[PDB]
Amino acid sequence: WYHRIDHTVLLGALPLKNMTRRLVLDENVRGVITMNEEYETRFLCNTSKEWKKAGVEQLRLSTVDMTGVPTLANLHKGVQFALKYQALGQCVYVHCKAGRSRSATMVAAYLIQVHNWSPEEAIEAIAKIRSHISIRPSQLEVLKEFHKEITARAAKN
């Protein structure tokens, strides 16, 4: 249903209400990145308040319609959110629907920034762990721009 990517990030299909307990206690999930929350499927998942109750903060992000990826700005929001919890030694569950594409792209951006890796290095790392990762050219191009921004911010240090 989901796979651990590293000590902080997990990537998986939409989290069912019933999984909350396991995710929080066993996987130390204290944050959740929710992409493209759809009204047709939200009865299956926690609301933002049901997450609070379990002590996890939810960050909701939208993809740029038809792109499969958020804006650069929201990619940075997602990554900084993950890093927030990395500093706390806690975990973040990253999802959209199937945990294969839009959510995979978000995790890719995280890995790019964390490791100063190429988009393809990050993607291949994710695919080595979780099957059916599918990051399309439209999604890869944004990860390419994200990679350039990460490098330029790194040169400022």
Swiss-Prot record:
Reaction(s) this enzyme catalyzes, per UniProt: a 1,2-diacyl-sn-glycero-3-phospho-(1'-sn-glycero-3'-phosphate) + H2O = a 1,2-diacyl-sn-glycero-3-phospho-(1'-sn-glycerol) + phosphate; O-phospho-L-tyrosyl-[protein] + H2O = L-tyrosyl-[protein] + phosphate; O-phospho-L-seryl-[protein] + H2O = L-seryl-[protein] + phosphate; O-phospho-L-threonyl-[protein] + H2O = L-threonyl-[protein] + phosphate
Modified residues (N6-succinyllysine): 49
Active site, renumbered: 96 (phosphocysteine intermediate)
UniProt topology in membrane: Peripheral membrane protein
Pathway given in the UniProt record: Phospholipid metabolism; phosphatidylglycerol biosynthesis; phosphatidylglycerol from CDP-diacylglycerol: step 2/2
E.C. no: 3.1.3.27, 3.1.3.16, 3.1.3.48
Subunit structure: Interacts with STYXL1; the interaction inhibits PTPMT1 catalytic activity.
Protein name: Phosphatidylglycerophosphatase and protein-tyrosine phosphatase 1
Source species of the chain: Mus musculus (Mouse)
Gene: Ptpmt1
Shown stretch of the complete protein: 37 to 193 of 193
